[PDB]
Design a protein around this ligand. Sequence first.
Ligand code: HEM
Ligand SMILES: [Zn+2]
Length: 118
Amino acid sequence: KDGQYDIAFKVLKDKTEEISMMNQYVVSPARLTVKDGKKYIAMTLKNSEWITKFQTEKNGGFADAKVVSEDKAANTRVVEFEANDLFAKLNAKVKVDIDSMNYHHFYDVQIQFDPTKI
Ligand code: HEM
Ligand SMILES: [Zn+2]
């Protein structure tokens, strides 16, 4: 049903049921927008300055999520991407850069939504 909803989720370490380090840097619940058969997720990233790339799987490939807003003062931003089956794991990729702590990596993670959770 068309509209905007809260949706809880967890970020999981690649190919596991373990909570990813990344989970610390996203806000749950996300906002799910349902619009004529399609589902979009708007998700807030914390420590935005550090997260230099964020991609999700779509059409067999990986695509940069759209940045729909940034809050420079809070150092957060909101990315938006499409989801299909809210009960299935969604593959994602993230690139992290922290110059001062010489931390420069990219990773694969899965996102797992839980439509039933409040
Ligand atoms: C000062 C900040 C950070 C520190 C000290 C740190 C430290 C670590 C360490 C030691 C690991 C490998 C050991 C482990 O799995 O716990 C790791 C893995 C990982 N980190 Fe970082 N990290 C930091 C920031 C971030 C940020 C901002 C992200 C955003 C995505 C991130 C995402 C990940 C991911 C996806 C992994 C692979 C394992 C997993 O999914 O849990 N980290 N981090
Ligand atoms: Zn690495």
